[PDB]
Design a protein around this ligand. Structure first.
Ligand SMILES: CCOC(=O)CNC(=O)NCc1ccc(N)cc1
Length: 164
């Protein structure tokens, strides 16, 4: 059924633990598959060694720019960008996993994990998964953010892959 993938996260070289995510391939197969392949690194590129570059407490933690490392870059397994698959899943609460974008139909590799219900993003960002285990690790990441999004520690995805 749905893939389970993981992100192991460090803050200034000290391990925070693991985040496990279910990808909703039953609802958004193209979006799920992109994220899965970027966790395994099987196309020759992916999230390993990239950072959470924008973290805003009581909102979300954002990551996945492995080309420019600053929120301008990243790419998908299909090309630079790919379309909004559908908006069937909603931002219902903490732990929701959703695609970052620069407007309609600009999905790449950047993603965010919500730390509250972000209902005003419904219809604008494609929801494609949720946190199964490791919300404590996410709350730690959140604690290193600020209003501007700047992080007070370097937060690195030191390893990632597929569990099933
Ligand atoms: C809570 C979600 O906040 C955003 O997504 C704000 N946008 C954002 O950082 N946009 C930069 C960006 C550039 C290229 C791609 N592919 C994706 C994103």
């Amino acid at each position: 059924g749905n893939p389970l993938v993981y992100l192991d996260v460090d803050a200034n070289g000290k391990p925070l633990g693991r985040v496990v995510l279910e990808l909703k391939a039953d609802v958004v197969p193209k979006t799920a598959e992109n994220f899965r392949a970027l966790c395994t690194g099987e196309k020759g590129f992916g999230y390993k060694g990239s950072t959470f570059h924008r973290v805003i407490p009581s909102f979300m933690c954002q990551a996945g720019d492995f080309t420019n490392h600053n929120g301008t870059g990243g790419k998908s397994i299909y090309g630079s960008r790919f379309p909004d698959e559908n908006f069937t899943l909603k931002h219902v609460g903490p732990g929701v996993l959703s695609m970052a974008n620069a407007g309609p139909n600009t999905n790449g590799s950047q993603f965010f994990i919500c730390t509250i219900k972000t209902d005003w993003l419904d219809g604008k960002h494609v929801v494609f998964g949720h946190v199964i285990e490791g919300m404590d690790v996410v709350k730690k990441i959140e604690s290193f953010g600020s209003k501007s999004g700047r992080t007070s520690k370097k937060i690195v995805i030191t390893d990632c892959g597929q569990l099933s």
